Amino acid sequence: KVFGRCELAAAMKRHGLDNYRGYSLGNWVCAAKFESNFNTQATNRNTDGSTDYGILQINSRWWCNDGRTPGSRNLCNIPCSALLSSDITASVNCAKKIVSDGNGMNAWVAWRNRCKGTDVQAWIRGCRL
Numbered sequence: 001k002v003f004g005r006c007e008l009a010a011a012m013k014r015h016g017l018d019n020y021r022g023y024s025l026g027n028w029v030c031a032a033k034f035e036s037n038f039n040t041q042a043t044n045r046n047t048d049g050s051t052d053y054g055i056l057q058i059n060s061r062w063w064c065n066d067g068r069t070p071g072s073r074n075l076c077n078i079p080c081s082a083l084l085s086s087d088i089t090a091s092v093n094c095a096k097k098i099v100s101d102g103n104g105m106n107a108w109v110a111w112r113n114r115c116k117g118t119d120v121q122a123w124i125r126g127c128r129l
């Protein structure tokens with residue numbers, strides 16, 4: 001499923017991401033846009049042989065099981081396929097664990113490079129939240 005911007009801001013808000021660990025909603029929407037283009041079906045293979053899955057490109061090295069990343073962890077206790085669902089619950093719950101893990105939203109390369117220190121409120125401007 002490819003979300004509209006405001007559609008994803010609202011879903012993310014429903015699911016408890018707004019100001020989660022002090023990260024305003026625009027931070028999450030911005031990170032989704034540059035990680036996945038708001039496409040829940042996005043998959044990308046990494047040089048280390050891990051894969052990034054879903055709307056927030058969560059990595060099979062640490063966070064989910066895809067049965068093809070030797071010596072990896074599954075710290076969100078889910079099949080990586082769970083993160084490709086049109087329902088973002090699984091992605092959001094895993095994201096909450098990731099942003100709680102010490103480094104905050106810097107775990108998302110696209111967030112660090114494209115959203116951090118920007119006017120991220122512009123990503124929720126004019127949305128019914």
Ligand SMILES: CC(=O)N[C@@H]1[C@@H](O)[C@H](O)[C@@H](CO)O[C@@H]1O
Nearest residue numbers: 052057058059098107108109110
């Ligand atoms: C939270 C999370 O798993 N982030 C991943 C990161 O590990 C990976 O290096 C990057 C590749 O572009 O995609 C995502 O940002």
Ligand SMILES: [Cl-]
Nearest residue numbers: 004005033038
């Ligand atoms: Cl957009």
Ligand SMILES: [Cl-]
Nearest residue numbers: 067068069070
């Ligand atoms: Cl594996």
Ligand SMILES: [Cl-]
Nearest residue numbers: 011086087088
């Ligand atoms: Cl949803």
Ligand SMILES: [Cl-]
Nearest residue numbers: 021103104105
């Ligand atoms: Cl933080």
Ligand SMILES: [Cl-]
Nearest residue numbers: 024025026121
């Ligand atoms: Cl915001």
Ligand code: NA
Nearest residue numbers: 060064072073
């Ligand atoms: Na894994």
